[PDB]
């Protein structure tokens, strides 16, 4: 009754943090471009004014400049191992798989009360949360391992909202495994008596 | 977390089958890393 509240609260927190990380564009502070090439306009002929930016997973934007707020869509594939890494960073499957697994986790917790005898639903929740954290790990590595194949950068709050989500998800996974252990420890004692 | 899970989740092993709880799993991973 009191240990499920932390699980429910933690699962919501982790899902919320991972949905705001995926959705927002504050993953990296680079110094690039945020406007398309001004062929005719010749504002800067070809290479526009590189200014401080805040990047995410899908769109790059500009903090300062005359175009402040314009947000271009990050182009991953430019011009085997490198191609596969660019297909995983472009789709962001792992940052999005974590979201789906964090969502499935909470669904199991919701189902863990309409069926109070099926103890295998609480185990599924814990597995989804642990697996969700694993996907987060892969996503973080993939994201970092991609930004190094292109050139004074810092990480934003949306990068630390996925990192925090991993910690929350792993801790919830422990609490859902402990509840499964506790549930099965309550069915042995009765059978022993 | 994974070590804790794979060691203590199954009820067909429990009193506890081993000492790999969450606290001990963290200790094991730390000692392993620190050589
Ligand atoms: C496609 C996603 C892959 C990664 C996540 C996979 C998680 C699978 C969890 C399935 C449920 C495990 C527990 C089932 C218990 C049972 O019915 O015996
Ligand atoms: C009995 O067979 C129950 C179903 C078994 C499911 C096995 C898979 C569990 C998750 C393992 C892989 C996790 C990967 C996490 C990152 C994607």
From Swiss-Prot, chain A:
GO molecular function: calcium channel regulator activity; channel regulator activity; ionotropic glutamate receptor binding; voltage-gated calcium channel activity
Coarse class of the protein's main subcellular location: membrane
Top-level taxon: Eukaryota
GO biological process: eye blink reflex; membrane depolarization; membrane hyperpolarization; nervous system process; neuromuscular junction development; neurotransmitter receptor localization to postsynaptic specialization membrane; positive regulation of protein localization to basolateral plasma membrane; positive regulation of synaptic transmission, glutamatergic
UniProt KW keywords: Calcium, Calcium channel, Calcium transport, Glycoprotein, Ion channel, Ion transport, Membrane, Phosphoprotein, Synapse, Synaptosome, Transmembrane, Transmembrane helix, Transport, Voltage-gated channel
Transmembrane segments: 4-24, 91-111, 121-141, 161-181
Keyword flag Phosphoprotein: yes
Localisation per UniProt entry: Membrane; Synapse, Synaptosome
Membrane topology of this protein: Multi-pass membrane protein
Family (UniProt): Belongs to the PMP-22/EMP/MP20 family. CACNG subfamily.
Subunit details: The L-type calcium channel is composed of five subunits: alpha-1, alpha-2/delta, beta and gamma. Interacts with the PDZ domains of DLG4/PSD-95 and DLG1/SAP97. May interact with GOPC. Acts as an auxiliary subunit for AMPA-selective glutamate receptors (AMPARs). Found in a complex with GRIA1, GRIA2, GRIA3, GRIA4, CNIH2, CNIH3, CACNG3, CACNG4, CACNG5, CACNG7 and CACNG8. Interacts with GRIA1 and GRIA2. Interacts with MPP2.
Name the record gives this protein: Voltage-dependent calcium channel gamma-2 subunit
Source organism of this protein record: Rattus norvegicus
Residues of the full protein shown: 7 to 214 of 323
From Swiss-Prot, chain B:
Intramembrane spans: 20-35
Compartment annotation: Cell membrane; Postsynaptic cell membrane; Cell projection, Dendrite
Post-translational modification: Palmitoylated. Depalmitoylated upon L-glutamate stimulation.
Tissue: Detected in cerebellum.
Miscellaneous notes: The postsynaptic actions of L-glutamate are mediated by a variety of receptors that are named according to their selective agonists. This receptor binds AMPA (quisqualate) > L-glutamate > kainate.
Function: Ionotropic glutamate receptor that functions as a ligand-gated cation channel, gated by L-glutamate and glutamatergic agonists such as alpha-amino-3-hydroxy-5-methyl-4-isoxazolepropionic acid (AMPA), quisqualic acid, and kainic acid. L-glutamate acts as an excitatory neurotransmitter at many synapses in the central nervous system and plays an important role in fast excitatory synaptic transmission.
Free-text domain note: The M4 transmembrane segment mediates tetramerization and is required for cell surface expression.
Quaternary structure and interacting proteins, as annotated: Homotetramer or heterotetramer of pore-forming glutamate receptor subunits. Tetramers may be formed by the dimerization of dimers. Interacts with EPB41L1 via its C-terminus. Isoform 3 interacts with PICK1. Found in a complex with GRIA1, GRIA2, GRIA3, CNIH2, CNIH3, CACNG2, CACNG3, CACNG4, CACNG5, CACNG7 and CACNG8. Interacts with CACNG5 and PRKCG. Found in a complex with GRIA1, GRIA2, GRIA3, DLG4, CACNG8 and CNIH2.
Recorded family membership: Belongs to the glutamate-gated ion channel (TC 1.A.10.1) family. GRIA4 subfamily.
Record protein name field: Glutamate receptor 4
Organism of origin: Rattus norvegicus (Rat)
Gene this protein is translated from: Gria4
Portion of the parent chain present: 560 to 608 of 902
């Amino acid at each position: 009754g009191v240990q499920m509240l932390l699980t429910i609260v933690g699962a919501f927190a982790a899902f919320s943090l991972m949905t705001i990380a995926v959705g927002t564009d504050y993953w990296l502070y680079s110094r690039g471009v945020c406007k398309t090439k001004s062929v005719s306009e010749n504002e800067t002929s070809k290479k526009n004014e590189e200014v401080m930016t805040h990047s995410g997973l899908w769109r790059t934007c500009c903090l300062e400049g005359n175009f402040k707020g314009l947000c271009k869509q990050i182009d991953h594939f430019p011009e085997t191992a490198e191609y596969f890494l660019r297909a995983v960073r472009a789709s962001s499957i792992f940052p999005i798989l974590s979201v789906i697994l964090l969502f499935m986790g909470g669904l199991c917790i919701a189902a863990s009360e309409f069926y109070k005898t099926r103890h295998n639903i609480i185990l599924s929740a814990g597995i989804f949360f642990v697996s969700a954290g694993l996907s987060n790990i892969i996503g973080i590595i993939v994201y970092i391992s991609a930004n190094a194949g292109d050139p004074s950068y810092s990480y934003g709050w949306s990068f630390y909202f996925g990192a925090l989500s991993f910690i929350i998800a792993e801790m919830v996974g422990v609490l859902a495994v402990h509840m499964f252990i506790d549930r099965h420890k309550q069915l042995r004692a009765t059978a022993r008596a | 977390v994974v070590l804790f899970l794979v060691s203590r989740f199954s009820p067909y092993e429990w009193q506890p089958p081993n000492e790999f709880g969450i606290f001990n799993s963290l200790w094991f991973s730390l000692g392993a890393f620190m050589q």
